[PDB]
Amino acid sequence: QWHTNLTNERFTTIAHRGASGYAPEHTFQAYDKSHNELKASYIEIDLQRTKDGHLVAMHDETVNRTTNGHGKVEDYTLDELKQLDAGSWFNKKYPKYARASYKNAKVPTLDEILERYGPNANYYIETKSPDVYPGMEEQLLASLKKHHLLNNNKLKNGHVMIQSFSDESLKKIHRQNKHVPLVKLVDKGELQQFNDQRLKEIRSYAIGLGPDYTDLTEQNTHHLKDLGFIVHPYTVNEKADMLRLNKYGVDGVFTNFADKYKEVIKE
Ligand code: NA
């Protein structure tokens, strides 16, 4: 009597920032790997916006960590951002997975991503506060619609899952389009902090809940599942934990190693 992934999968494999563990996060390389090669359930995307308003995939608000550049993403125009090298940094940090082709990987725009993997892929997109990038939500939905991902059919098959730590952002989207599946990202330790009334309300606009995996235990997991939630704890890269969590009853996980999780599911 619980809820199961809209993709109709008992266990969904969310490729955290793409094939994050083997390729430079948020790059065609990383996405190609997790989607084509490892064949993971979702292409997980983190949104940031350029100076001239282009939604692009990048985890931090600054290009420092993942490029040969410095500054806030919004200080760069899409054109300038495209000059950056979004791959080299990966070779240097993870020599054991390094690859010559990773050099000069580019930062992708949300449009390019949807464009590239088409309307049959499944996307897990994250938004920031309605104050940090005003208009982000309206833009995301417009982009999704452009790429035919807002069709009700696609929506109830799990082709789209919008996630965020900002209740404000999710609520804004829910008002604008009640049909887009929403996932509330819970912070580390924050899961405990909120009671049933809280969960009850979160559940009024979000079908899913994505807590830090370390805050999960078989009991709360069951409880959440009971409250009608779909649970996708985040960034589980250890087979051991993958197995444990699956036993608790989760519906999938965010991971930088799609294959490890898919194998744990196979067994
Ligand atoms: Na994320």
PDB file of N, CA and C and ligand atoms in Angstrom, residues 16-17 44-46 59 126 163 185, ligand 1:
ATOM      1  N   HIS A  16      23.715  10.939  -9.920  1.00  0.00           N
ATOM      2  CA  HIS A  16      24.105  12.208  -9.318  1.00  0.00           C
ATOM      3  C   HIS A  16      25.075  12.997 -10.203  1.00  0.00           C
ATOM      4  N   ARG A  17      24.578  14.051 -10.833  1.00  0.00           N
ATOM      5  CA  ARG A  17      25.397  14.882 -11.706  1.00  0.00           C
ATOM      6  C   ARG A  17      25.949  14.092 -12.869  1.00  0.00           C
ATOM      7  N   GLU A  44      20.595  13.505 -13.413  1.00  0.00           N
ATOM      8  CA  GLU A  44      20.425  14.492 -12.351  1.00  0.00           C
ATOM      9  C   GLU A  44      21.123  15.779 -12.719  1.00  0.00           C
ATOM     10  N   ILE A  45      20.366  16.877 -12.717  1.00  0.00           N
ATOM     11  CA  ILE A  45      20.900  18.187 -13.096  1.00  0.00           C
ATOM     12  C   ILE A  45      20.784  19.278 -12.033  1.00  0.00           C
ATOM     13  N   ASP A  46      21.848  20.059 -11.854  1.00  0.00           N
ATOM     14  CA  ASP A  46      21.869  21.155 -10.892  1.00  0.00           C
ATOM     15  C   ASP A  46      21.865  22.437 -11.701  1.00  0.00           C
ATOM     16  N   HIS A  59      26.896  22.570 -10.161  1.00  0.00           N
ATOM     17  CA  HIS A  59      26.539  22.429  -8.760  1.00  0.00           C
ATOM     18  C   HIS A  59      26.717  23.684  -7.915  1.00  0.00           C
ATOM     19  N   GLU A 126      17.227  20.188 -10.121  1.00  0.00           N
ATOM     20  CA  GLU A 126      17.245  20.939  -8.855  1.00  0.00           C
ATOM     21  C   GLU A 126      17.255  22.460  -9.005  1.00  0.00           C
ATOM     22  N   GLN A 163      13.423  18.774  -8.016  1.00  0.00           N
ATOM     23  CA  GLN A 163      13.833  18.690  -6.628  1.00  0.00           C
ATOM     24  C   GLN A 163      14.379  20.003  -6.126  1.00  0.00           C
ATOM     25  N   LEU A 185      14.133  18.203  -0.872  1.00  0.00           N
ATOM     26  CA  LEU A 185      15.456  17.793  -0.422  1.00  0.00           C
ATOM     27  C   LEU A 185      15.625  18.182   1.032  1.00  0.00           C
TER      28      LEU A 185
HETATM   29 NA    NA B   1      21.902  18.106  -6.576  1.00  0.00          NA
END
